[PDB]
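Subject: Interface between my chains keeps coming out wrong

I've been trying for a while to get a sensible model of this assembly. When I model each chain on its own everything looks fine, but I need the whole thing in one frame so I can look at the contacts. Pasting all components below, labels as-is. Any help appreciated, I'm running out of ideas.
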Amino acid sequence: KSRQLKAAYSIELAQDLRAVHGMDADAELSGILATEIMLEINREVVDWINYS
Amino acid sequence: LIAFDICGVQPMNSPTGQVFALRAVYGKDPVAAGAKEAFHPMYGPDAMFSGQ
Amino acid sequence: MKFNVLSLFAPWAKMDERNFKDQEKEDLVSITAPKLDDGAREFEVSSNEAASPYNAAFQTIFGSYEPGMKTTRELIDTYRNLMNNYEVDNAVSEIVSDAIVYEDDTEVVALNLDKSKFSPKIKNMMLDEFSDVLNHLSFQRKGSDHFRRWYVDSRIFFHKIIDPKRPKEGIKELRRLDPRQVQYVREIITETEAGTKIVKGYKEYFIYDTAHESYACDGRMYEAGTKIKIPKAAVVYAHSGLVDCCGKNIIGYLHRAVKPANQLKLLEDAVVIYRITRAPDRRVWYVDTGNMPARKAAEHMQHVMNTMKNRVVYDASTGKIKNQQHNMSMTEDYWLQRRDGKAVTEVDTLPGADNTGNMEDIRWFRQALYMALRVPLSRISITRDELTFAKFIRELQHKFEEVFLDPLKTNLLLKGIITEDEWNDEINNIKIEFHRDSYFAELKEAEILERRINMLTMAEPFIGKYISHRTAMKDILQMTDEEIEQEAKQIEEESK
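Reply #2:
Try treating it as a single job with all components included. I did that and got this:
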């Protein structure tokens, strides 16, 4: 069974984030999404254990 | 093109720039309608202010 | 959000902050193209004077290195893939082995200090530190391995450490960093009319990746996520002068051989396969079975094909035909049954793997590769090939050498013995000399001397009127005036 997340953020936002906190946030969004996937899996595994 | 030597440029390092300016004023309230300036290239000074 | 370096590196960062603070006051201004020849990759950034916190720096360091960091990783593996092949590895071996030797009861590569110094105490201090530099590379045991990897990839990096509370004596064993996770750049954040002509420090930034996300072999990790920004003061490194046609896209010493290395391998396999495929007798047996669907026609075929079948295999462990009885038939006597009164049922034979070479191209290409890998081509007295080889080895040694010079000059500053200014205004020469094979060195010298001697013996009949003795000694024996005087003095002493 499949899983996935989208970010697809704008250019202008990234251009400005860079000028405020020095963040490109490609990395931040990428991080968050990948993180969210791994964490959701973390729970999936735990939940399957508790369920079974 | 006549690019930019007939204007200021002050290139930005962020969106949203700002500029502050000082005025010399009087009448016990530097900020009021009717407050008067001390210096102005187009207007003579209030010659009686420190005087009679 | 304006984060600093992990504090463990801060002492190195501090050294760099000082280095840049003074570079920024330098008069290397009014420069069009950046004053940079090699090493770290340059990039035009945000023109914001001193705005270089971790987040911001990452954004541009990463953006700068990214469009080609993949390529960089591919080249590392490409060079390694060549190193893993035969008739490649041996070229590298010949070079590495001669570049760094260790010998029987001899010294090892060592610092040669023969220039003026304030006090000779410094020569001892530098030599003592140098020895310890080698201890921190464990050069005496693995120096040739460092070199080999360096050579193949054309770069090596090491992480330097400090106490850090007493950083002056925190100097300890270096840890070799695999380029796979190392990024290096030069960033520009100043601006003037029509570009940036301002003295630029570039900050020499390094980044060390995290998870072993990329790989050559399997057993890889999950996403790296963030990466760590590291000061250059913290990294010992060296690299080749070989760069591809753009930027700082540095290449390996074997880069040249990648084409023919792979090409030869394809040719070699083409030969191997050519002679195997079709080696055995080949044919298709045909059975004419009228008015039948394959599901039934097949029985007619079985009545022939499973009757005439030669159930034979070859024992490759013992060169025999497995369970062959009788030992050998005199004739492969086969038959085919024709149900109709027509010569149609037949056997369709095929050609085999005939030996028709003319196996010449393989040598053309072997030789091209052999040379592409860095001659002498004499390997399967003193010649031009050996002489140019030795020059090459010295050139390699002089780049590799930085691996010692970096931590040496660093340690001698960090422990407060010599100032930075003194080092820079003094050498001018800090050459580290290698031990070279004495077998060959003696032979080279002996042959040269024979010729010199033979020439002295030609001058002899005329030397009494035509050639001074000093002249014969400086021209034929290539002796220095002092050397000449010293032997003359010794010669009178030898009388007794």
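Reply #3:
Confirming on my end. The radius of gyration of chain A is 16 Å.
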